[model samples]
Target: KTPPVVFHWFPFIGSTISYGIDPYKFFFDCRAKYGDIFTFILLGKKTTVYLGTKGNDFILNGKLRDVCAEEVYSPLTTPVFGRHVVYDCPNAKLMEQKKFVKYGLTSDALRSYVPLITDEVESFVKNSPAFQGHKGVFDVCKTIAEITIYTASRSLQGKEVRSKFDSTFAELYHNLDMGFAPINFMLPWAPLPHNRKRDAAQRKLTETYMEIIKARRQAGSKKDSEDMVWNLMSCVYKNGTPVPDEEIAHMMIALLMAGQHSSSSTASWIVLRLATRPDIMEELYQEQIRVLGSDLPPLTYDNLQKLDLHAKVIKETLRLHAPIHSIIRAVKNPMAVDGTSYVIPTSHNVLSSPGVTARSEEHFPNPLEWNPHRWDENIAASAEDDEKVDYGYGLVSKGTNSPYLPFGAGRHRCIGEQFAYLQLGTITAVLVRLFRFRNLPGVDGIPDTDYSSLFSKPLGRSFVEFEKRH
Candidate 1:
């Protein structure tokens, strides 16, 4: 009447080492032995996993009464994201918060973001020492990380926030980022140096945002930009209460951190993937020229949609490297499996891996191969076919049945999906126009993924050479 429990030698550390080291490999290994549904001990807690499209729907779209994300994530996220927001609050509150965020991500707002993002990329290329000469090597993750943050800050986070990144904010972000270290999942309160830094960073960042909010209020709340701070400041919950200043500050941090990691990893992968195949990079450049003009006009949100290969490159990269490998929820009820007689008990947590379906040969031929051209066939299913639901945020596709859910499905789906694609696409396009990337001399393939933290990224310093197109 229950899913099979994965065999483990230790009671407390059961499967933690394997899962923490490489979750995909661990999921595949366990799936082979347990046939898609299996429970394993994670830090003394029984955790069940369900694979494939059915699994994605079963776990991610589970009823709020049966599964709870906050219970599983709050201890880890609350300190970092701050109180009364995200997983720290009730699902209803989180849903409203998600709705508030959507205010800044509307189509008009996205339209304005392209040039801002492009300017950040072009400016970074011109000033940064890495792109100084006609040709040179630069670290892909490091360079792209800075680029993503700058672009996101400038576009979504507002100019005042963007300005701070040049000063103390960057270091504060790093310290706060350490809060997501895997160990913090179980030991977030541990008085370790990293945790200490995490706490201090959290405080200072919150203070910084509060000060900005205060200054804006002092200025008579004149609407200057379409950044998130201005958006969140005016938002009111269903109770008719305006979003508090502190909550606004916290939500800003959450938005920045959420977008930063996933976009950084993905943008880095796009560059690294291009380094391995300069041909695609050239096609991307030619697509812009052929489609836009021989003069290579400035990018805009509308034209960006026309860069078919560029869009595909982003799609293909997300398929291979979705930043979050596992989405877990605490079982709130003794929920029965759809087809099986087994029940996932309240004592266990359930996990979903949409990436598995994306990588499966059944859904995608030669899934491991990073070929953007595969999209040319149009074999994958469309999200438009799925039913739509409004989880207090807005109408979104209940798209869990799709195998290629890089952004995820249901209530917890990433609202930043559009912005991520936009950010990644613009960065890729700008770099394509400016330079051609190749693996550093003697380096044949890309770096292995570092899954040490919650998000997965290319391991260590992945250096690649860039030849200036001009």
Candidate 2:
């Protein structure tokens, strides 16, 4: 037996419009009608959606033999991310690449990144025209996007890359980012203007990275910092081949692009949320003074741990605004629903939405409210006894059992989880110390999310008033 498909007017465009407009609305509506499991047509293909914690474990932690991420994603990602890494490579190679990335994110590396990220934030605020006056409105998404890219480039991407942002690299990054447009999932090679820009940007970006790598080799440079380029260059594959320069360049692009949209959206939400709740903003400022010092000493990795409220704010933001709303996998084998008579065919794709569970009233009371203090009484850590599996990268908790999986689970879990928190934490702390954010007059709440692209973000041109702290 097969799962019932959602009712639709057209066979080809079945449920696409409604799902594209607001996936959560569609998921909730369908869940009420179809229960936990149902199939829907997406671009003429049957996609089975399974919701809740059980669904998350079912889809996200499915055996590699039964599910495939590359088939669903490579057509969209390979052109943008380039070949020989990520989805373009074999799963074993991708795992090794993930392992190589993890090596550079060790505790010592993270320790060094705090000051660099802090400096980038402070420098941007000091120099950018957006913060020129004592009290002025700044576009939340735009400002935060720039700040995110700068800090990421300065810290993880290295000095030369950060310097390029002052010239043409920033534009190239924006063009490259356009590659993630939702339509590209179906027609990435189409000769559209944005696609043309995306391709051009991808080529130039690869060349730029290769140029940097070549110069480094020519200079006979040794390892100097924890930046990803140097770490990738030093890596050797299990087959005894040193990672190629082209692949190293591609991996750098993947690393920065992977974190940029998610972190930007998340940091933007943090500011917008603070603007709506000025009291929490004030609490954050006082949190630094009460815990660190009245003078608000320079942020360091050690002291960042003491700001408990600050950490909760980030955790809560992620709960409500996880960047990726859906994770999809192409089914490779006929699979039966454990508790149902449904058998999903290999031609179908499986979808999971951890965000639904994260926002459900069952797991989180008043799930729509943006209150960080809720964490005060709740213990939300993953089960201590959860199973750990090594997907060639390292041992990671098969963490799909939890309702709040912002970074995802299983082998595909974000390796940058620690770095995201660190980067977001430092940025929020620096902003808290600098100014107070408030909603503009007549602006009652945060802007609605824009789901036009793969990563969800605040809708266009959301602004907030910022008053510089004396």
Candidate 3:
């Protein structure tokens, strides 16, 4: 028999509320009743969930011929990213696009980016009153949103594109971001004003990016550049056709949209989590004191690598809140969840949640609590199974089957994992070193996850007061 179907009160909108309000809770409630595999209808679509590590592998590493990402995400992603790139293209083309973007995130590129990222973070602190002389408070989400976008753009798109943020382009980006709402994901061209702005933002930003491309092409090798846009312009796919400029623009849009929301949210949570735990914050401070000396110098790629505490903070934060709670894949052909009789047919979607597994007691002891100390001395989040497997991207740890997958695993795993660490780590280290953040008085606990958002960002405006360090 197939996995049991979840009951829903309404037709067409079946289980939308139960699944959407807070997916992890929904999974927990259902798993208690339905076991690991079960089917549920979402907005007239049938989504079969396979929970845990094996499920993660089963869905994420399914044969490309049998599962297509575009089918599931294109309705939401294509309008934002535009045509001829990402989910708008075939899986083969998407792979090449990922490979091309990967070129810009090499060790050399990261090395170049660290100092630039450092400068951007430092500048934000200095210019914004949030980190001014004595003490001030600011919204964590708002502050980090600016930081992630500026840092990502400066590093990934080169200085020219970064310069545009100072002008009308910043508002264009804001409008573009506004388009990523749940409503637009389903009805991209709805008669809503925000939807209108979303379309206009796409057109305007595309033109602006094209201008930057034109200017760069004119300058040619006369100017040195180390960014994704420059590198993307130089690549030729296996088919030998160079990526067109417009497609390059769309890809840039896709990459920016992908990284900004998740990174900003994760960074904000790290700041808040650290705020609540002063002892852990003190430990991180001591680590910086130990490694960087009194001078603190400037953050380097090497420096970030050595900040083990900082890394754990990010890891723990993601464990608590892996931004993308649900990773969905569209079934293109008949596929069986091995070891089970369930053969999900064409038109069904397979859903997996790293966030759910990340919090399991089977994999993580004291699963609900926040504790970076778990990895304190060589204790891993999940012990390796020692079964080697290569699905062909690279020889990663068999531990990928483990329960702590914040960055995801498999061929479609995010290519920006290294860059994300570099970016978020740099921001965290600098922010922590320069100032101590405290949650506003009278606030009793951490903010709830705004499940309505496209990503799991902290809900509402969270005020974090900062004082310049002694």
Candidate 4:
């Protein structure tokens, strides 16, 4: 019932990488050492509980209503990525952002983005030289990052914006992720190498954004004649005028940070999964051909909806190998639950490790076994018979506000949920259609990650090769 305690330790990362608890390993260790609801240190300064079923609902749903996600990351995200405004003002921003994305999260938006995503994927695939040289070596993460950012950039800012900043967008994504490091965030004043990189990276991002803003004004013109940029530019508040560029920039930068990290990681996983399961690749390849027929456009929401098996595989992979392992929220003001009168003392944070919940045998049979069939109708029905809420992508049978919020749930659930699926599916659809991937030894599996950093990525670069589909 008591929360985790925070304590600092030795550092090997200059001042930045202060060697603290290994988060994932720490969670596993804590579960092994303590019980399900034990608390631990999140870097330093703050501590929270590792909730189990009983406590999970308490933390996410009710026990701590004021424990907000926006406030937790606001201070850190705003200064570094200044354009991110939502977290600065959670309640009002949530209302607006929620309304906007709710409108955009429909099947239609997914339909609209098909060309934007598929075109990017197709261009990448063609340039990849799958058959031209018989093989090629590319940084899977970097490649996916560029494509994902470009696609997202186009969606948010229009085509002109994408073309102008393609070179630095992906690196900025890396830097923003690095900003999540324990040192850069909690102990930012310390002179750490990662923090230095964080500054340089953020500056580059800000400079590019400023340039884009300046150029548009200088030309006395606008682009977005073709995308979300157009949609936003043309939009007027109830009072009837365009949104300020600063606000748009804030929303866009926040979107940039929030959107790309997982896509990059998940896309990398798709390739990794393909290499390991050639049989699945063959099945998916056949499915892709059956769905496309001829050299057709990439799978849009309409066609993507048709590929139930394909969707099933993608969901299972995400559940099994989650790009994000935890969800965090801060307990603000005061709160209590289940007759326990413990107070959160105004700024205590809560941490829910999704990887653990995804692996829970009570909800997931055999926990570690990967089975796409778990997503089938009969299974979904059976699980629902036991009573569950369907939250679009994740299984809410556990509870809409259950501890297993992989992409998060409720008011703060991801807006990019639809986009993520389409992007991953397009990449999966094409890669599966074209070649069978082979994992390169240690490079194929999940790499050891440095939890101390803000965004978690494979420690050693994950590399792969492919044999042309015959």
Candidate 5:
């Protein structure tokens, strides 16, 4: 039994603009008429969408052999991430790669890196021209994007690579980023200028990383040199064969690129959301002051964990603006969705949206409102840390039914959840402590999403004014 199909006006393009332009509206509109399960043509491919938790599980946690994530995301990512790593290899290899990266992100490792990340955030806020003149209107997206990259590189990729970001390295990153735009997902082999630059950037960036990986290999595993590079170099496949050097280099690229856009976008939303709600912002600042004291002790991993309000702010921001709006898997076998006769078959992709599900009234009350306070009520997994389940990397929560999945759930869940919270929490604490910010208006309440890219963030430019509270 197949699900009902959503008709498109065009033969080929078929619902591209309707779905791609604003997926929330598209999903909601379709759900109101056709119910939870429906199939539609997107960019000439048939995609079946399962709307809520029941659907999320059937699709996201489907038998690994029956569904393929690499099939859906690899083409979009491989050219940028390179070959023999991530989706370029089998899913088993990707899982082991995740384990390797996860090894670099243990509790002790994260605790050690908090101060470095805090310093980067502080330097970026203080030194950037956007924050010059003591105050100015600046786009939070731009402000946070560079800050996210700098801090992520310093802590995850190491400082030697970070020093190069001030030079041509930043441009190379931009070229790689261009490759992620939705256009490349459809036209991966296009001879356009951006595609040319994407290939060029991948080669240069991977070569540079190869140089670093080789140096690190020769330097041996210094206690101070522990980072993703070291962890990945030491990791072996399930078959016990060591991963090749080029594979490790590509893995580094994937990690850096994966962490960048999502963190930057979430941080951007948090900045703007905080600026809009000064009351909440003040409460957060007071929480930081009260906990750390006025002397402003350097944020440590232990101290960073005590930041409840900072966590709530980041949590709420993710709920409203999840960096990766859509999660998709390519169906390889016909399978029944619970409660419906729909059997999503091979060649059809299945998609689930945290954006839609997280904001659904069934899960969250007054779903449209950006209320971090909603989390205070003890609803959703974002508010709980009581359970544990490990797929391979470590023990995560056993629960997958929660409506709020900012980092996602199941086998492909993000390994950087703890790291993201640490980075975001530290940045939030530092900024709230140092300054008082207010929104500069050119738009309405919550900013609209720019959907031209696959990873959606606030649409257009956003300016906000920050004044030092000192």
Candidate 6:
């Protein structure tokens, strides 16, 4: 078997065309041209072999040493996410740093987050420099980051961080996100303007986390912590040693990266998707009105779990517009798949994609159709329908196999998944339940997504006006 010959470059067309076009469309073109597996050099890197549905195992279920997500993504994320945060790097202690924060987001933690998210959304309508208008005018991306951070912080860090989140923390957090960027993404240490901004952003975030830690310690010895700070303050490493301040701070940063960024993009798409579908929104409001018996529970855990239609739509939106498209992992040793004994060299990368599988018409029937009703059961939306499938958590449908991994699957599955669902469902339930969002004159949907960072987000300013639900 002859190895696929690699094309060196073409007036930078691969980079330009790949970035300029929507990734879903771009990868679709790849599937068309390459038939599920082929090599394409993106951004002048060595050729990366792209694999589709048939190759999911090589990336998701292969030996830990076989695939290196942290390494392949290092070129793009090290400046922002840090190589240390990922396991393959020389300084990889922080890899499970996210896990230390995970235990806090247990069922009990999610149970406590409803009112916080509800209050935050209502407060956004009631006050704020950015969104205070009777008809608030604000950017959706900013709104999502602030809302998610406040909710997560309140659940994890308690009220101190939650209350003070608006002052300079908003700027600090957003800046911290931008701090990992184009410069670092390209050459990383380019000494360029973007690189400089990214470094400053990281500092702002670090200081903010440190201050929260200090404040929490000073308050000291609460009967119950109520949020994630308690978990961080009490967490012990494998040997029962306490976690370091820098490690904890970086852990917070990692959650923000995983939770906030993806959640924001998902929320943005929700706003975009909902704006065009008023009937769907109406059904949601009716359901809320019927369930709560009034309009003021703030989507509690009970309410969030009961939000069957809203849950369906949220899942559908992510399926339609996922934040991360391409996933990569290399095999540590030789492997056999469909009678092919392939040796994936230890230090290289293998690409596996969810975008292609999700959009394909074969399994989805009508690939481009967007319908939350597909997930909604005819029997008053059976919650038990989810129980039929196994998704490591029993009943997730292991949807990963079917174009449905909003949060990657397997051991690497996002711990914040349940947290994100509760939050997205609550936020969507409240906002859609209260105000009606109208996509301006002709802008009826999210602009085609632009891929810069590892995630995919809408490209342009999407203007929508909200009219309170009567």
lDDT of 1 at 343: 77
lDDT of 6: 0.63
lDDT of 5 by residue, 1-470 (tens): 26888977897688888987888899999999788888888898888888887777676677888888998887888999999988997877777788888787877788878888888988886787877766667878888898999998888888767898987898898998888877787898886999999999999998998787778668765645346556645678778888777887788888888888788888889898988899999999788778877776778988877777788888888888887877888888877666655567888988888778898999888998999887686533253453456666666654566777777777788778888888888888888878788877544476789865888888968878788875
TM-score of each: 0.97, 0.97, 0.94, 0.80, 0.95, 0.85
Greater-TM-score candidate between 1 and 4:
1
Clash count for candidate 3 is 0
What would you estimate as the lDDT of candidate 5? 0.81
Query: TM-score of predicted model 4?
Result: 0.80
Q: Which stretches of candidate 5 lie over 4 Å from their true place?
A: 221-226, 379-390, 441-444
- Per-residue lDDT, model 4, residue 233, is 52
Model 4 pairs whose backbones collide: 4-39, 4-40, 83-250, 180-454, 181-454, 388-397
List the RMSD of every prediction in angstroms: 1.6, 1.5, 2.3, 5.1, 2.1, 4.1
What is the per-residue lDDT of model 1 for residues 24-117, given as tens digits with 9 covering 90 to 100?
9898888899888888888889888989889999987899989999998888888898998998888999998888888668888888899999
The residue-level lDDT of candidate 2 at 297 comes to 85
The residue pairs in collision within model 3 are none
Report residue 415 deviation for candidate 2 (angstroms): 0.6
- Residues 27-115, candidate 3: write the lDDT tens digits: 99888988898899888888989998888888777787898888878876777778889888787778778777776677877898888
Model 6 backbone overlap count: 11
Residue 13 Cα positional deviation in candidate 5, in Å, after optimal superposition: 1.1
Off by over 4 Å in 4: 1-22, 62-65, 101-106, 128-132, 136-138, 166-178, 189-231, 234-242, 291-298, 339-347, 377-404, 441-446
Question: What is candidate 4's lDDT per residue for 1-470, written digit by digit as tens?
Answer: 34434233532232123223245555655667665655445444355664566555655554325777776777677656664356776455454544544454456656767777777766766674433455645556666666777676665555655775655565665666666765456556455777777777766666666566666777766543332343255434445656565555556566667767677766776666667777877777777667766565556667876666677777777776666666678777666655554556556667766667777776788866666767665312112233343233333334444333456544455656667777777667766766767766544454555444445555556667766655
Query: What lDDT would candidate 2 get against the real structure?
Result: 0.87
TM-score of 1: 0.97
Residue 194 of model 4 has an lDDT of 72
lDDT of 1: 0.86
